[PDB]
C-alpha cells in the first residue's frame, strides 16, 4: 500500500522521499538510478526498496469507501 517507513535491510527512513522520488521521475523526467542517487540513497537496499514498491493504496482509494 504505502512505501515502507524504514528499509528492511538497514532501517533507513525512505518514506519521506517517495513523493520526492515520484516528483523527480515525473517533473524532472529523470531515470530511476539518477533520481535515487539524487535523493541520497547509496546502499542498494534502499534503492530496491523504493524502486520495487507498488502504490496499491491509490488503487484501493479509487473505490467509493
Amino acid at each position: 500500500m504505502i512505501v515502507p517507513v524504514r528499509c528492511f535491510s538497514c532501517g533507513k527512513v525512505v518514506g519521506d522521499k517517495w513523493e520526492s522520488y515520484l516528483n523527480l521521475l515525473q517533473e524532472d523526467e529523470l531515470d530511476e538510478g539518477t533520481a535515487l542517487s539524487r535523493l541520497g540513497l547509496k546502499r542498494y537496499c534502499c534503492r530496491r526498496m523504493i524502486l520495487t514498491h507498488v502504490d496499491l493504496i491509490e488503487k484501493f482509494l479509487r473505490y467509493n469507501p
Binding site: 504505502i2 527512513v13 518514506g15 513523493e19 520526492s20 469507501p65
Partner: protein, 106 residues
C-alpha cells in the same frame, strides 16, 4: 477508523516513525517508575486526526502528529523531519468517506 488500511497495519507504520530522543536519558522507562496509565514522566502522548472532505484525498505525514502530554520543557518526542518539502514520513491516505482518529503513546 474507517480507512481502507488496517488498524494493526497503521499502528505498525506509526511505530517505525522516528521521534526526537535528544533528552531520552532524562526520560525514564515506564516499567521502572511507579506510575499508572502511562504517566507523561515515562511516556510521550500524541494524537492523530485526519479525514478528507469530498475530494483531494488527505495524505497523513509525521507533522500531523501533535504532542498532548506535558514534556516539562524537554525537546523529546518531536517528529523528525528531513525532506526538503518538509511534509515528513508518509503514513496513509484517507478518502472523502474515510475517518481516522487515534492516539499514540511512545
Amino acid at each position: 477508523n474507517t480507512t481502507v488500511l488496517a488498524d494493526e497495519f497503521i499502528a505498525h507504520r506509526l511505530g517505525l516513525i522516528p521521534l526526537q530522543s535528544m533528552d531520552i536519558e532524562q526520560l525514564e522507562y515506564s516499567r521502572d517508575c511507579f506510575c499508572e496509565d502511562h504517566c507523561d514522566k515515562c511516556s510521550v502522548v500524541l494524537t492523530l486526526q485526519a479525514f478528507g472532505e469530498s475530494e483531494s484525498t488527505t495524505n497523513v505525514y509525521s507533522k500531523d502528529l501533535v504532542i498532548v502530554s506535558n514534556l516539562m520543557g524537554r525537546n523529546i518526542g518531536h517528529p523528525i523531519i528531513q525532506d526538503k518539502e518538509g511534509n515528513g514520513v508518509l503514513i496513509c491516505k484517507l478518502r472523502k468517506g474515510q475517518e481516522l482518529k487515534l492516539t499514540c503513546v511512545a
